Subunit: 258 residues, 5 copies
């Protein structure tokens, strides 16, 4: 049972941070990029290396210690950080045509963020159930052909960074009562990125009963994916490029019973 | 039916939560969620698609708590496509974008559709080509004539069976469906990019202009869906439909009627 | 006419429900809903399209219950393109997207148009090329001059016959049509993808800024439509227009006038 | 200077209704609505476009009923491009999409613009290339310098003559035009599809934030437009601009001023 | 500062009107508004763009009528890109769309950005490739590391000099800029079509959720912009950035503040 909101100067706080992307980082110079994408000969032989698989980013942020009172997340400001970096079309890129500039980052993107009072809850779904996922990732276990559409065995929490591959996992809509999530997959082999920034846009996190995420143990959970597309180098090889995401969350003290 | 007052009290409401898996053709035991590779007839007259090359409408009849005159009234819907991120597998037997590039993602013609009603969805048959010979095990427009390519009012059916009603033959009958709410988008084009949004913050109200939602005949709720996301292109250039499951959560309340 | 009060009571309203079939040219007995393959003239002066290569406006005059004064007033419209899923037939004599690929779907230039009025839709002629020779059996701008390529006020007509008024020759006349509500979108481009939405939950209100809808002269309602969805490309590369039927449901009420 | 009350009574309102034809260059007696085929200079220094290759702004000065202090205040606008369906002529000396295909439609760069004011539209010159030699018979930015490629405040003009002001070197001057309302969209790209909407149900309000419309000096209303729809490609591959006429309906009321 | 009442009366309001020119690199005396043709490095480690190949942020600091505590408060903005129609010049040393066709227009990657603030726009550095050698005459993220490719909080700056801060290195810092309102859109893709709207009827309100707009420290208003419209392709296939100027009209009112 959720009771009244506490008022007074002491009763509000603000969390501000950036989540870095976890795209695979194939060497010591390539933070923010995946390994070049290679293609299996068959579905049966699909076995991507770890450094080729973008993962969900997650941060657990401690809040001022309370105590029952709980911090309630009320509003969010968020945007992708470094959108202009994608204007570097002069660095080992495959040219658009002879003498032209380098191709920009483009193609499949996934832009996702969530705010919750506990870890984001995940459901596994596989493009191909016979994919061998690599050591160091957490992926759907006991995959069957049903895993290609819905196998309810594949439940997890986003409770580790650099671990849950984006392609295996989505927010579980049957759970996440204490999280608000938002995402868009834009597919297509060379779809153009469209990235907006502004410090004037706010998302309200309150449900239809006027209640936002309530932070269990005085911890706020922030999650993101910002796969912007693929970068094409001069050989034609392509690799995922991600960007960091900014979060500002405003919270207020809420009394609750039981 | 004269519709009267809504019942109140803790026990006056119930909730249905459910996922509908796609029915894309499933051409072998490893390919749930996909169709058979598409092949093209040399003439309109010789068009004879095999069953496993034809996506069909998904449907579920959900029994509700027994009432009797009270009827369960569907008031709100939350819904979304499950597994959107699986379309980021561009390393599994796909045709490369170009020399050394990543695999092409699922793209091209999509149909995204869902409906909620208190009885089976009512269908009207329309055929691209009236001479198409539909296969055994499908339910299709019978006694087709050349008028069936635009409108033949003989072709009426109920979506009353799973893996049966091919998507390309049937649409919701706008002359009926008074006790169902339906929503769908066909986005065509040989390589249109998929755009799939997920969030747990969106709700659709199913009440009509008079404040009445679908009323469940025999305490049965009917959910229907199609989510053809596009086509996957394998290394040989062959293309097959790929579909994804759909989540439904519906809130219902008891309503007295005559 | 001075428009006075709306009549009330159970008898004061009526409903019109119907479908208008497309008139795309119907080049043979198997190709209802298609045009003849498009041929290209060598010069502007030699452009002489055959009748079966020219989509035309559809129109229906629906008689209403006899009233006499009182007039039937059109208040709301539900409308929908019927058979949108038929465009997923990419296996019937289409040109392949690439070697071993599925057939290309209908795509390219579309015109989607509908109007509701109390009299025939008023048309203004505008010609792409004033030297086009239009075929016997069609009604087209007469005495064309070079000014007909931009605006020649001699070209006035009424949409008063089916299978007759070519889409490419005529538009709604914005200088007239006070007693009609019309809505249209031309989406050009050689392969723009169709985007077709269906739902039974959308209504368009036909009342003007003074709260008055179309008033039906002689107790006749006029419905008009074009739904050229794009072009179908067959195995040879030849292209032909494909159209679909449009559903209409109009609510009308009795209105006194003087 | 000082705006006082609006007049009322049956006599206090008037309406202006007209169309502006496009001025695309009209390269011969058969090609009203089209420009000359577009050629490309070898260098910026040699850019010397023909008069008939340059589309121009259209303008109409419309005398209003004599008033005298009272002034006509323009309050609402309805506007529409006339002849949108003419772009469905893909059978008249067009370059085929591919072998045996239909002709390509008009597509590529478009500029759609309209304004309503109580005096001539005020213009600011901006040049793509300051060394362009603009031809005899056009009115263009004089004493051009390299700064004219970004902003040269010397280039001020009034849109006070037809077939004179090339579209490509003039825009509405945002530093002036207090007594005009203007609206325009440049949609660029080598083959972007045209999207043209028509309806007689849409009104634009011309009142500013103080509820004051353009005030017609000397009882003249000024209407201006450009509707370059894209380029038409003939069989040789050569391209020329295609424009259409624009309809205006403006409602005005008498306003007292001191 | 406590924000108190707005002052009223005929002299309590003022207006600022100006245009910011684009700073795209200006590679010779005839190419104001354009960058140098884009060249591509062989490897990430050899990326070394010349200054005239790098578009930069534009900024203007405008002095306001001297006050005095009262501060000018920015309330509304009208803005638009100036010269949108110039992009219809497809007849001047462009690569043809196809044989005998017209010249390709400006297209591909665009960044359209503007901000209004009562102090310099605050910037955060992010690099596509941390080994890029940025040229003399530009102000760029210093002591770059591989972390700079995603987030290195050392890269803080103020947009306080024109023709200096390269667009590709810098973005508005969302952790600061309390006294600025900023808006931008990056539209990527190798040949995305520009869509540019002009009108004198659109206004943006600069007030925050508490009804307070940017407060002008020292009676100065800061305006910033980028309008990289895309790339022009010349007959050889070489591509270069093309930018346009941006108009700003800002309405301000006098606001009393404490301490």
């Amino acid at each position: 049972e959720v009771l009244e909101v506490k008022t007074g100067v002491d009763s509000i706080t603000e969390v501000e941070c950036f989540l870095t992307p976890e795209m695979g980082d194939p060497d010591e110079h390539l933070r923010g990029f995946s390994k070049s994408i290679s293609i299996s000969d068959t579905f049966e032989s699909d076995s991507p290396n770890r450094d080729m698989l973008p993962c969900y980013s997650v941060a657990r942020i401690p809040l001022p210690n309370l105590n029952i009172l709980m911090w309630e997340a009320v509003t969010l400001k968020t945007e992708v950080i470094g959108v202009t970096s994608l204007m570097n079309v002069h660095s080992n890129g495959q040219a658009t045509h002879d003498n032209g500039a380098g191709k920009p980052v483009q193609g499949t993107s996934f832009h996702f963020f969530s705010v919750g009072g506990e870890a984001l809850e995940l459901q596994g779904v596989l493009f191909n159930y016979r994919t061998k996922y690599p050591d160091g990732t957490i992926f759907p276990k006991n995959a069957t052909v049903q895993s290609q559409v819905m196998n309810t065995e594949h439940k997890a929490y986003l409770d580790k960074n650099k671990a849950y591959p984006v392609e295996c996992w989505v927010p579980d809509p049957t759970r996440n009562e204490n999280t608000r999530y938002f995402g868009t997959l834009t597919g297509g082999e060379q779809v153009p990125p469209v990235l907006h920034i502004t410090n004037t846009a706010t998302t309200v996190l309150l449900d239809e009963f006027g209640v936002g995420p309530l932070c269990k143990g005085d911890n706020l959970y922030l999650s993101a994916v910002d796969v912007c597309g693929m970068f094409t180098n001069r050989s034609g090889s392509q690799q995922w490029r991600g960007l960091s995401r900014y979060f500002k969350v405003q919270l207020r003290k809420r009394r609750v019973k039981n």
